Amino acid sequence: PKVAVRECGLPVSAIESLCCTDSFALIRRQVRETAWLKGEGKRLAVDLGLLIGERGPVLVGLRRALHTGRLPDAREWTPRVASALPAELAARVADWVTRMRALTRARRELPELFAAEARVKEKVLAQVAADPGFRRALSLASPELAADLDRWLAEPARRPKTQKLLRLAKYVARAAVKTSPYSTFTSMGVAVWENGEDWADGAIVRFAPREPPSVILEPSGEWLHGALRAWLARPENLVRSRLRLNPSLVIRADKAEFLGFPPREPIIRMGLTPVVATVLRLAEPAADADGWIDPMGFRDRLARDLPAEPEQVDRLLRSLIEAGVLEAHPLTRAGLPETGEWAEIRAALRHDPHGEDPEAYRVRLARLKRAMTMMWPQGDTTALLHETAVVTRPVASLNPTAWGRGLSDLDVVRRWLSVFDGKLPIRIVVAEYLRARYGEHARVPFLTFHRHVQEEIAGDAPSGADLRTFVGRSAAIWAPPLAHSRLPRLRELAKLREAARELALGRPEHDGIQRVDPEELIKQMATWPEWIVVPRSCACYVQPAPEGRLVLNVVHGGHGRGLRRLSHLIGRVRGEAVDHPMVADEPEGTVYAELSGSLGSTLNVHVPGTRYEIDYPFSPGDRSRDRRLPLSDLEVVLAPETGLAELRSRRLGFRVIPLHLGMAAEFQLPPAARFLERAFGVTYLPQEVTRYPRVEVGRVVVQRRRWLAPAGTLPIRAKGEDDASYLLRLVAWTDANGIPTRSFVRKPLFLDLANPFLVKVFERQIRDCAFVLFEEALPDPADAPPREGSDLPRVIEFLVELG
Ligand SMILES: Nc1ncnc2c1ncn2[C@@H]1O[C@H](COP(=O)(O)O)[C@@H](NC(=O)[C@@H](N)CCC(=O)O)[C@H]1O
């Protein structure tokens, strides 16, 4: 079970140190003492009223004060009144009055204490934000705010505006508690399993001495490919290019059908002249041993098979390239040969930054950005540069006996979550289209199927209705409109989902936890029909929590997706590749094949991890010609076992399972690739305060405890000069509703009520919000796994690949 670890770049002490510990402890005492006094007051009013009617004024007024929570008037609580009561009631009343008086004075003290503590935390914020790793991450993410931080550090007691402080505090929180790839903010490395036995400890994990992260700077894939195509279109770079036939090209005995340039990937049908048709035929023998076509020898080769005239062998070739039938690619791995502008880019990208302070980093990046735009425009490209932080040595060892039950529970969970996959309706609808248009035993060239489906989506007919609903632009009509659908299997799916949900939720809440036994989900699964197929491998992102819990954040496709990028980034930093193991082709008659090349994204560059590959129009791969399945070679058939559409190689017979193993999001995939993944891939991806409990499937936390608060329930700073009195009212409301001190509020906001910065960020974000969802912080930052020496505890997250 292959494992990686993502670690926050700031230690937990970084956000702990921003808490106003003294005044919050007093805010908490006050809130609990106010609630206890008000409760006790009302109970003492009951007992006093009993006493009143046991006799048969003053008492009626004292009663009224206790009931309503105010100090009794001097005339309502006197030695005589205390005399007319039973000693135990008199003493209870006495204690209440004392405590009420103490509470009132402590209410008066609080605002100066809190204000003074909050203000001291301003300098603690700069202390925490001084970290070099953090300033570097911030410098990429937010350069002006980062320069302002650098000035603050150089000029202390140059107290920046509140709004800058809130922005800094938010990034600090991100870097201390959020395990998302955002830039130097977190870093990633591999974990290993270490010899049970050595864990008398009790630890589930043990960390090596902290390796300083190494950083890899990369250009926007979209920038890169726009600039590359620009260069490949210029006449002089034909001799610096190789050519190949577009692997979507299909000659339909008359016309050429193919897919054109990304990102709008038009489906193209064009008329062949007999000369163009012969040009396309002679591309075959003109090809390399690996399919590439030397353009010079091809222009001659054409000169002496057509008539001679080179002047128009060139324009004909040019017209084929501009059209997309023949693809121009550069001569070398990643970038262009060594042309002037490209070797500067490539070197500046590669520049080892060592010893560089954040201001020099900012300067350097701004300069690189310019050279990029004085070459191909940014356009609407958001971010021209990304950075990623990795470590080269294993970061941690894992305790295989303490992990054990958790991984077992996780596998059961991983399988059961298949029923919820947002691609299942797609599969069902696509399969039904196949059956309806072409017949149960039909075998449809993939490209013709893609075109037909796309025609249905663009047009108007009821034959296209389901495709438009589930495969078209839309999440659905309202929610995924199953249950009341024409297709039986969409309705069977809806009931299978409802039964899955009701099995999970049909159980008691004890201490805010509903606990599902994994064997219950195994029992439910043995019942499912064959058209729910469980992926063979999943990347499970989990965070450990107390009592051996794994909190599941995210599942995606496995097969090394994620890990393969990590191996390739480590390989770049070390200067030697990591042999990530290959995907096994199984059962016989089935192969797994990733899409060739990187499909326009730097997040798809990785250890090539499938034997064969789907050879994809403008995204050449790195495989022997015999190991390429061109789009032209794929067909779509209905499988008898599942009744779902599958892919076959016409040339070789195998069932072909398309894989996306790069880290590009599915919407960044060009259209036919997106369709392949969505349709053929085997991965998945009121009126008062309402509490939803946490849901665990033995030790795997599948849903964290939550609290839903409508707009109207949540305290609002009355801008009648409200100040710290606000925190008091907010903490009174949260405590009364069981909302913990630390939570993630809905990208979720980390809220520490003790942190004066995060409370204000919270105040500001939630205005004009219809609902506010609080989620327990689990693991809590305080629960971060311990360390040795001077390495401070950090929040972490594991990528665990389960197979
Ligand atoms: N209830 C809660 N308890 C405790 N930790 C919570 C948490 N909710 C989020 N986290 C953390 O913060 C992160 C979301 O913040 P954001 O990056 O989306 O803005 C989470 N990270 C992830 O889920 C990762 N899979 C990466 C997600 C991605 O790539 O977008 C958590 O680390």
TrEMBL record:
Pfam families: Lant_dehydr_N
Sequence ranges assigned to domain Lantibiotic dehydratase N-terminal in this UniProt record: 130-326, 584-745
InterPro entries the record matches: Lant_deHydtase_N
Name of the featured protein: Lantibiotic dehydratase domain protein
